[PDB]
Design a binder for this molecule. Structure first.
Ligand SMILES: [K+]
Ligand SMILES: [K+]
Ligand SMILES: [K+]
Lengths: 90, 90
């Protein structure tokens, strides 16, 4: 079943290649959506695809690239909008 | 590789069969550890095993059983201790 998850990731998550890494991981898992850094220092992302794939990426996001230290993730499930491909946005 | 994750799950997470469901899901993925309800209304869990499997379970934990509404998950990575099997504790 196709699901859509809206994430907010906190901790030491910027300046560690998080966006690039999530995109890489997303493509490998086949997840669509986007990711971006917010001015408050957190990371925001939209994941859309098969629940198994999205959940796998959510789990990975709690680890992130080597230098990342995620202390918390807030998820909001929503209705899919037809996202295609995973991109790094502003 | 083997990893250990300490979780704190918040939201509408108790009285929805979360513990039973996480145990079921854990056995299916082959994750070791435990889960339990805390008096402050949150859920606490320890997941240990191959990172791919643990991450999969963490992702699932953001969805949880049908009635569950997870608003936040706090993860803390630690050194594995040799957990074996997944159980529901007090
Ligand atoms: K940061
Ligand atoms: K990390
Ligand atoms: K649910």
């Amino acid at each position: 079943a196709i699901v859509r998850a809206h994430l907010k990731i906190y901790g030491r998550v910027q300046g560690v290649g998080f966006r690039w890494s999530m995109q890489r991981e997303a493509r490998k898992l086949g997840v669509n959506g986007w990711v971006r850094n917010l001015p408050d220092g957190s990371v925001e992302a939209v994941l859309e695809g098969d629940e198994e794939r999205v959940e796998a990426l959510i789990g990975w996001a709690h680890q992130g690239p080597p230098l990342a230290r995620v202390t918390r993730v807030e998820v909001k499930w929503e209705q899919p909008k037809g996202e295609k491909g995973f991109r790094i946005v502003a």
